[PDB]
Design a protein around this nucleic acid. Structure first.
Lengths: 89, 198, 67, 80, 81
RNA sequence: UAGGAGCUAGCCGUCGAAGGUGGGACAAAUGAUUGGGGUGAAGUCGUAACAAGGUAGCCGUAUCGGAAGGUGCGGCUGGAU
RNA sequence: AUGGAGAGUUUGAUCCUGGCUCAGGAUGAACGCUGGCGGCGUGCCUAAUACAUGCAAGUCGAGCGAACGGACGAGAAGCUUGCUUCUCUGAUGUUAGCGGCGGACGGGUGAGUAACACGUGGAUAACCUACCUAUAAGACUGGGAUAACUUCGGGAAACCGGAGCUAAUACCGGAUAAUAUUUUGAACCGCAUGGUUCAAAAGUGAAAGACGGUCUUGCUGUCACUUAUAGAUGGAUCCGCGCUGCAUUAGCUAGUUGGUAAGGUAACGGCUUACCAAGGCAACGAUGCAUAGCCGACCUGAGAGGGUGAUCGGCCACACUGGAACUGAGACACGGUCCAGACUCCUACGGGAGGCAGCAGUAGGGAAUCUUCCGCAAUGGGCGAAAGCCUGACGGAGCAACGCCGCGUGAGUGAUGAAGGUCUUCGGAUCGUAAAACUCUGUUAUUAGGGAAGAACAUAUGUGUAAGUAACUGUGCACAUCUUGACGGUACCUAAUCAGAAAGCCACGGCUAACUACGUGCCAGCAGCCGCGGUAAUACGUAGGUGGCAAGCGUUAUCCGGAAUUAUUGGGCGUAAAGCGCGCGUAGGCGGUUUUUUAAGUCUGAUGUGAAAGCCCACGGCUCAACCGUGGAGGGUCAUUGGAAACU
């Protein structure tokens, strides 16, 4: 379906993911629906989680699914933890 | 870079600042074979080339290191002939010569590449790194002394304008960037800007 | 040539290995004061070696750099 | 919503309810900036043979009722 | 080096089309005769559709036909009804 | 019975890709030989044009001469008396 | 308005005019010669030539038949007291089916296509949509087969031809409700037509498993199932404009051109079929030819901009060729089917097969463009709760200076003459504070020991909460317990190490800074224009200096600036190239003068507002940097919007 993924950047052996929620029928670096935020877990300490969680309230409620690695940083950073009450509507 | 011995280099180019001077021994007109002859000049286009040659050979780099700084002199919208020099004066090449860490720059510009100079903290291996003014230009504590390190500190004091220093393991501060008046008239800096115009 | 066009190509250098049927390489580059012929012959590349007794034009004419 | 509602003026009403209005305007050479008049007829379907000769017909686009019939009739002003 | 799906699909679509030419041919049986027998005001002039509108929605209740085609069927069927 | 209705099958005529030639058309390549042109050497002969270049040019045209040129009729000076 | 000079070139000597030539950039460049190391990109441009092999799309016992092996109690003992040799409890796995999904994804190519194809702006009152998410209708009934097993046959073959059998959440018949549907009336724009209640014959679903705990089940959680809405996806259809050139292509079409009725499409009609008039299309060059995927993007231009597409993204087209269909929500399907064709292969000669433009590799052609490489660790996708498989996507390694950035080829001395020749009317400064003969440093390098991030995010590891539930797994949501890493012990850090082992090339004529001797005798040969050599060449060829600048230097070819030789900006037509022999004239263009309407054109103002690497300005990440993000700027060009009339 339409789903959040990990679309990367950066030079050799160094990724810079900006997340994208888009269809699974596209390639991993293909044309998108929405580039929400970035996620650079590859640092010395931080995962550098920048998130604009306002639009997960839309797409996860009418068709978008978190998928098995983009699902559990939301359970880690707390993006879906705010959605936990927002899914409790 | 250059990697020479500057004893004939004071006589070869316009000037290259070897030491106190090296031209007074033999005839100082030319090094040899055609000099004291029909003494021919060259053009003003070649004079700015020669004025480039009095500063390319002075600062010792190649082109597109003396030349790629010139387009960032087009980013700084002051006088192009001298704001090029103030970014050229804002690197680690002023350290290995001017503040005395050897009897020249070559033995000390070796000493940064070993990881035996270690400015701004842990290690800066390269002298192309611009010394962004404010960082503590330090000295490795595992290479404190040599026959060259602390010797020419006593010879040459006055670490130049907007770069201070110490004897506290010979560490500096580089508090700001020096202006064109802290750029010597050994080669006229204004006459490089038009050879790069051509 | 490969595309079977017949030319008249200048053979630079002094000695050669160009008696006949040498499978050679050909540059451009016109020789002036010579009508029709406006192509060079690449020395030392395809089936010829370059000329030997050169010491000021050594990179051209198929001569490897000495020592 | 609506659809596109461009104007024109007839040239030749074809046999059995096909009028052909004329649109023309002024495009330029962007190398020169000088504009020049140019024409592009967009053929309208007349529903009841409403438009006449001389009529500065304002029409309105539709989806194709036939091969050419992309536009339908709203406004007709005069006749010669 | 054709994989086992291509040799399996050709036989399951042999039998799935045998299930598709089961009912669609039986629907194209029905549009050959129940179309031809609803007309001309027959014995079942208004009751023949109880098999026709039965079976053209039996094609619509599965993936046999488009529902607008089933709408296209009732367009010419119930105009006669 | 499987007779009707249909279906598999059966025939029966519309349209078919490709094919088959069929004529051509168009394009390219080649062809014993040839005839205009360019370059070189100008090997050769003549000296036409530039000096009123030894008997001013120039165009349209026409004719002869291998060619240069020869002439003739209209027009032009971009010519001497 | 950060740019816009150039060098020469018609003579015996000038001015104009003119092309031509070089100086300057770049290239997927390639070649001659050279070659330290990293950090980086790019990588058959030719034959959309042909292909051996490997090899690249799968999926699930938590569907249910099977059948196999088989742990599993497994007798009496086979008395060799150790096995199962038997039975059934037979799990899990294998099969190999039936089954649902996928096959249209990832991947590759630009032949066709000069066009709605692409770009961009609109529109559908002509739109569809499995799965996903939410919304409600709810899951009644019967069910044969049917592979599997047995049986006959072929052939080394391959894989088939026949006889009887078998399960299902597979499958098919019976009634159930819906904005279905055509029959009756009340909404407005887009003539037709719509709009949301209306009110009616109607219409039919249907799937049951492993299971938390209960109830030998119930909400069916799981994951579906089929009925009426939506959200979404991608695609469809229809008009604006940007979109190569040839009139040595002018007359183009005849289901064509409009309409008239049937189709049928998610809808439209000349789309086809019976009818009507010749109409419609055109020099504004329809028609046809030739050429070419399009755009973003690249690139250099002062701007006016226009040339590349290997790049790197978005869209289109293709999958030996050419047709036809099936299935599927979605195909006329790159590792589906059939037909026809051409090529290739195996054969026991009976008939069997194959389509590298998926990734390497092979041949070919070419000047030339990667290893028959590794691993899925990350990501991302596929079916499955998950685990698992597939990754020839991807992440890496190889190889190449082909190209970008740093790194190199290392120093204070001391003879201007220690030993030394491109000269001498030699005496000399001299290569040359060069150097033997030393201080010293250890980029790299030699080489022997720590080692790293990435490698964090799950499912694994219960208490729970939320919709809660008959109660509880389940699912979203807090832990904190634990998983694995191609690259890789590579990178990195320590020490030891020698001043260690490393730049090449073209001229030295004038352009242009780098000269002198031997031959040499218009010869060899150089040759960007002018030109050198005929016995005194600085120019050739031979050799020391230097010079331009560094792992390159030089040549070759290719686009741009220089260049305002296409001159809107910013060209000429008397003698230089530019007026037919003159007209008259068809079209076309462009037209005197003075008043008033619109705001169309003009010019402004409220916003939305123009594209990703490319593009303004300032930081962040890179050891510098090469190379990647940030923040507005933001469009100041287009649209949704208000206007103003001198001038059109």
């Amino acid at each position: 379906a339409v789903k959040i993924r990990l679309t990367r950047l950066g030079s050799k052996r160094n990724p810079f993911y900006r997340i994208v929620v888009a269809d699974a029928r596209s390639p991993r670096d293909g044309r998108i629906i929405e580039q929400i935020g970035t996620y650079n877990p590859t640092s010395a300490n931080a995962p550098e989680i920048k998130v604009d969680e306002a639009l997960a309230l839309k797409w996860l409620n009418d068709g978008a699914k978190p998928t098995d690695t983009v699902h559990n940083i939301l359970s880690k950073e707390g993006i879906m933890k705010k959605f936990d009450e927002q899914k409790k509507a | 870079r250059f990697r020479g011995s500057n004893w004939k280099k004071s006589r070869r180019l316009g000037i290259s600042l070897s030491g106190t001077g090296k031209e007074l021994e033999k005839r100082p007109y030319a090094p040899g074979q055609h000099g004291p002859n029909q003494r021919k000049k060259l053009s003003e286009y070649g004079l700015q080339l020669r004025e480039k040659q009095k500063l390319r050979y002075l600062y010792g780099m190649t082109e597109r290191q003396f030349r790629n700084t010139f387009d960032i002199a087009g980013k700084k919208f002051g006088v192009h002939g001298e704001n090029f020099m103030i970014l050229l004066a804002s690197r680690l090449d002023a350290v290995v010569y001017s503040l005395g860490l050897a009897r020249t720059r070559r033995q000390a510009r070796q000493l940064v590449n070993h990881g035996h100079i270690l400015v701004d903290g842990k290690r800066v291996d390269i002298p192309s790194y611009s010394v962004k003014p404010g960082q503590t230009i330090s000295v490795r504590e595992k290479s404190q002394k040599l026959n060259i390190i602390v010797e020419s500190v006593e010879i040459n004091n006055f670490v130049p304008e907007y770069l201070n220093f110490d004897a506290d393991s010979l560490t500096g501060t580089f508090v700001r960037l020096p202006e064109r008046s802290e750029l010597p008239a050994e080669i006229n800096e204004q006459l490089i800007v038009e050879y790069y115009s051509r | 040539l490969s595309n079977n066009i017949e030319i008249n190509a200048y053979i630079p250098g002094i000695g050669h290995n160009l008696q006949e049927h040498s499978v050679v390489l050909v540059r451009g580059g016109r020789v002036k004061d010579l009508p029709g012929v406006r192509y060079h012959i690449v020395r030392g590349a395809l089936d010829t070696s370059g000329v030997d007794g050169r010491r000021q034009g050594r990179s051209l004419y198929g001569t490897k750099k000495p020592k | 919503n609506d659809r596109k509602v461009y104007v024109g003026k007839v040239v030749s009403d074809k046999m059995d309810k096909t009028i052909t209005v004329l649109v023309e305007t002024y495009k330029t050479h962007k190398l020169y900036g000088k504009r020049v008049k140019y024409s592009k007829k967009y053929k309208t379907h007349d529903e009841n043979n409403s438009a006449k000769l001389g009529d500065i017909v304002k029409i309105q686009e539709t989806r194709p009722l036939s091969a050419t019939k992309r536009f339908r009739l709203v406004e007709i002003v005069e006749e010669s | 080096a054709n994989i086992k799906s291509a040799i399996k699909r050709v036989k399951t679509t042999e039998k799935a089309e045998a299930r598709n030419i089961s009912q669609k041919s039986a629907m194209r049986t029905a549009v050959k005769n129940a179309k031809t027998a609803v007309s001309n005001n027959a014995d079942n002039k208004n009751e023949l559709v109880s098999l026709a509108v039965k079976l053209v929605d039996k094609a619509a209740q599965s993936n046999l036909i488009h529902s607008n085609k089933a709408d296209r069927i009732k367009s010419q069927l119930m105009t006669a009804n």
